[PDB]
Paper text:
First structural insight into lipid scrambling was provided from the X-ray structure of the fungal protein from Nectria haematococca, termed nhTMEM16. This protein is part of the TMEM16 family, which encompasses calcium-activated ion channels and lipid scramblases with a conserved molecular architecture. As common for the family, nhTMEM16 is a homodimer with subunits containing a cytoplasmic domain and a transmembrane unit composed of 10 membrane-spanning segments. The lipid permeation path is defined by a structural entity termed the ‘subunit cavity’, which is located at the periphery of each subunit. The ‘subunit cavity’ is believed to provide a pathway for the polar moieties of lipids across the membrane, whereas the apolar acyl chains remain embedded in the hydrophobic core of the bilayer.
The differences between structures of nhTMEM16 determined in detergents and in a lipid environment are most pronounced for the Ca2+-free state determined at 3.8 Å resolution. Whereas the structure in detergent displays a Ca2+-free conformation where the subunit cavity remains open to the membrane, the same region has changed its accessibility in the nanodisc sample. Here, the movement of α4 leads to a shielding of the cavity from the membrane core, resembling a conformation observed in the ion channel TMEM16A. This movement is accompanied by a conformational change of α6 as a consequence of the repulsion of negatively charged residues in the empty Ca2+-binding site. Generally, the Ca2+-free state of nhTMEM16 in nanodiscs is very similar to equivalent structures of its close homologs afTMEM16, TMEM16K and the more distantly related scramblase TMEM16F, thus underlining that all structures represent inactive conformations of the scramblase in the absence of ligand. Here, the Ca2+-free conformation obtained in nanodiscs defines a non-conductive state of the protein, where the polar subunit cavity is shielded from the membrane by tight interactions of α4 and α6 on the extracellular part of the membrane. The protein surface of the closed subunit cavity is hydrophobic as expected for a membrane protein. In this conformation, the Ca2+-binding site is empty, with the intracellular part of α6 positioned apart from the remainder of the binding site to release the electrostatic strain induced by the large negative net-charge in this region. Details of the conformation of α6 in the absence of Ca2+ differ between the family members of known structure with the conformation in nhTMEM16 being close to the one observed for TMEM16F.
Author numbering:
A (entry chain B), B (entry chain A): 15 to 416, 425 to 460, 477 to 585, 595 to 650, 665 to 684, 688 to 718
Write the structure that this text describes.
Amino acid sequence: ESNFGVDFVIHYKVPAAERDEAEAGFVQLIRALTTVGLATEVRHGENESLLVFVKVASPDLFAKQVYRARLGDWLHGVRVSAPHNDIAQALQDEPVVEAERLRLIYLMITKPHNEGGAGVTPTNAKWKHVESIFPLHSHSFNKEWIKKWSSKYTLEQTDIDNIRDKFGESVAFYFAFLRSYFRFLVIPSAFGFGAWLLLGQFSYLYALLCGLWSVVFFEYWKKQEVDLAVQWGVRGVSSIQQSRPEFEWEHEAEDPITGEPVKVYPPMKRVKTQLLQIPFALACVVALGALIVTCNSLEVFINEVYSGPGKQYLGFLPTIFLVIGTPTISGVLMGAAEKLNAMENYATVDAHDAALIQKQFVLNFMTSYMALFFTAFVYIPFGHILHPFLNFWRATAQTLTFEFQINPARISNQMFYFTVTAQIVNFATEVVVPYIKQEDHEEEAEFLQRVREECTLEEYDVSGDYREMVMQFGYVAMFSVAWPLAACCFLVNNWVELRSDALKIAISSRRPIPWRTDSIGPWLTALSFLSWLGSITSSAIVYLCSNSPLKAWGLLLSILFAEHFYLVVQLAVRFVLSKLDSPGLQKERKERFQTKKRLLQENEHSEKITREALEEEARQASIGTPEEMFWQRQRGMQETIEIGRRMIEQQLAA
Amino acid sequence: ESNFGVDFVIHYKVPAAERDEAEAGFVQLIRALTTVGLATEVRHGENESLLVFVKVASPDLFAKQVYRARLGDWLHGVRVSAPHNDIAQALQDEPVVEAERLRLIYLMITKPHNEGGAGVTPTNAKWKHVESIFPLHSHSFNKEWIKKWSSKYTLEQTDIDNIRDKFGESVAFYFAFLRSYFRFLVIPSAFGFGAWLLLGQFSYLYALLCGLWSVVFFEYWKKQEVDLAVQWGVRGVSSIQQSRPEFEWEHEAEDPITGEPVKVYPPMKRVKTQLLQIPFALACVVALGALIVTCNSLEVFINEVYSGPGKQYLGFLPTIFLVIGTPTISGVLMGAAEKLNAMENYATVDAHDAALIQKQFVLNFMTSYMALFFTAFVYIPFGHILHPFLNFWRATAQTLTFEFQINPARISNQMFYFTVTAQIVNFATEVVVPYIKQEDHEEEAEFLQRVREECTLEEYDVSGDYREMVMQFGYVAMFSVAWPLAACCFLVNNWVELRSDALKIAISSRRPIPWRTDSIGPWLTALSFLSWLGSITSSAIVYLCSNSPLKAWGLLLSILFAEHFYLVVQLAVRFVLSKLDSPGLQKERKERFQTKKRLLQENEHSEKITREALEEEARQASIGTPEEMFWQRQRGMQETIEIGRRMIEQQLAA
């Protein structure tokens, strides 16, 4: 019921057709890991694969690897404090967590021979037989962490920090983002229930309240992430770039910024294939745009010809067919989001995911809101354009079988359907995968059985759940005025999602390779664009749905005021939160000072000043006469006093 | 025709009534300067004053003071490079400019006994007799710098950098701002002449062109000021705070950020008197607002009753009376801007001027544009409100002596009057002060005569001319669509102002005390607010003056589009100028690395890994049996190879 001290496990699938190649690749593989010091053990595997097992035998090699990497961060402004002990006295001062151990094991299996490692990245030239490298999961800790989280109402700061200790900094930021979003969701939750009782449908004051809250939360989290990165000491790691393993280069570069020549790729080949997203996004506009308008017009056509024999669940049934249908059609578009992104050669693995997301978000931006956008910005202001699409469907239904009444209250029903049915099918997909999983020395067989299962588990992507919580922010920031129970219905989800995603890392995936990132990433832009867009369409909805024919005086002012209510209250909160004097920033200017105070500690009056007058009076004697005779006029300071006093009475005589 | 090596000159006016006090103060003063090492010479003065003359005699004291201050900056991240030589080998590597010399002389006369100086700040408790401390001006360099500038068409980067060498960094930023504003003025200058020929009055395309240029200039200067601060090595000096001499404190503070206890002032007493500006600004609103409406209504009343017997110069004569009258009434309001600011106890001398300016700018914001604002936002859209003020003046003129026709083209005449007549009276005031100035050992009398004049000169404030060039940007960013020759008429001024202000430091003022500031200061906000406000009222003017009755569809869209044309092109240029890879930033990451590479240089394979297996096999022998017998199953890596190969054929047998 425990591990055997193993750090990482390499899969190395061996097929039948490339048998002699994979066998010769294996002995070349197992040679390479032994040079960098990995104590190696080979075990059996399923589908005729060979799971080799690695660990660091020599601690003083391993502590030197810790001492090398801690020196490597200290050069880049990551660590303010120097190690100062070339022998392991620095390591006894600051001990290695299990995250900092496993990364430096993973660096010794991935870094090339330039950086002192055996690079066994699978996507490079040979070893296409190595399928995956993974650390084994500790089920002993894992059972406690679920149990201790499931009994807890709230999550303390020591609960989030324990995730950093064993799962890395990038995984711990997702729970630290979620917890600080779960807590900040209660403010439009409770006020979204009070606006349901008091204010009624489409109030103006809730839109100004939500557009205030979405600034206050987002500016608070940007302050909180620079405090947490100080606390884990990962502040500034985004400034470090790490080169990509599968990055291809045409030539090496000269005149570098770091100083040593780097391998580069001419951007005219990259800006060609980056321009390929412009027809790809525009086709995906008219893919999803034609898809919504053929479901939305058909849905409004069916309530006119059947007159609703069932209830309103039957009236919106293709819209329900869209929400159960969208996580499939998001799956095919994320595949084209990743193939188009890997085709573009990106330099760093930070700037590779920094442009994956702004392709991944915009594609998810279309498929999650343009169904709602067509209700409140096409159907409500002018449904006269869809009247060709209605009678076109009337041409079929008469041949098949052998008065528009545009309701302003359609979106509040539609926002209700996008809220709960997406929350059902999400919690359906977070319950069905729990329900779809449900020789050799005769001692480690149960140990080996959990490993043989763990290769079948997929990797856990942290970005796959940021994209949900950002899209969950989009319903609250933009369209929550249509149904202010959404912030009430998201808050019950974010409690269980904080324990559902804790369960998803627990049993439905292997342990991720621990990484280091300062911020959440490029989501801080996508959380900020949704906040600003949640000022315009939060005000433009409450003007239309609360509607006299609609005047452009009314819309263009209600947009301009609330969008400039945003920019004022953005500058107020940025002013206020600058003056909160965060404890992560007080310590950083402090602890930098004592290290300089260390080097500070590393390193008569009248009688002196006459001697340089004696010095210059020798040099006029050796060789001008205005300059020397000016200064030697009053030689000592006592001579300056008496002449200074006698010039007063000389003036006082006059 | 040269100085005598003197650094600073202290005035110390001695009156008749406090004669014995000032005389006893003088001997106490001249005692204090001799302790910190100032070689002292006393000379005569006018109005029965005693000009004492100071210099540093001992160079090794003075080099240690240089070595102390260079260490002081290096602790705060100012200097990337360490001095590394406690003896003066560091100083021979990087020599002292005359600016860095005079500041450290001035620090020894101002810093208290805590920081190792004799604080002789005049505004502290005793020595109210010391009037001013000033460095003497070098007329030898000064005659060359005017002559070499007056022949030059353009100013090279070595011309601006010479100002830093003798006048400090804060003075050199004003010319570096002016030169980079003079050069960026030619873009709406030439395009403002082409819009005069082609487009005519109040074009829309020029407003989008100017609102583009005002982002491109301002974002360029913000990039350029972090390059110049790197080049002078003053980058980050704003992060250093310097305490104020005249700051009063109630008690010392505990738990500090630097570590040592500081003297503080409870903010409830300061936020009381900071709230005093709210009635002060609102009264100055209705001071200047009532002042414009009683001149503007009277001016439009005089063209109706006299029918213009003279020409249009006679028609706008109270508006001309306002522009010749405003530098006087700006003088009285700047006095209340400085008395109200000094009454508020500010901590640092940086944050003292950082709130002086936003009082000084807003007060100058009212008196320079609200005359134009009432033309284009009250008179043009609805002049029906001023009709009481007309017939009120008609009640007087009939008793004195015993049909509105609102012209849309009034502002283009009025913008012409605010352009050239302000430029006349400015160049009048920059020519009239040149035209209003036009015993003792018998050797230094001509030397002493230039000093006796120089006490009568006032100090040169750098902020007094930033406020002009920011206000000059306000006419271009906001109201240049009314008269696009303004950018043509400002460009001829900014050439001569670049040599006029070079003349004003030359003869019409003493040499300023050299300081150190990273940016221009809080003008970067006031240049940025004017840029954003130059998007709204640059579009709202061209809608009204080019005008059918005016629809709120038209105004509210023309505001919303151009103001969102601003925020898009702000984010584009911030994206583009981030990717220009400025040479001031390439060197900073470079030169930081070699200093870390210095500390980097300050600090078998298979045969090792079996020994820890031999280590653990002794410890199972001393004492678990799954963990040990797993790892000692395949002891050496060659044993891992053969079992790893035989598991393949075992699988291949199956």
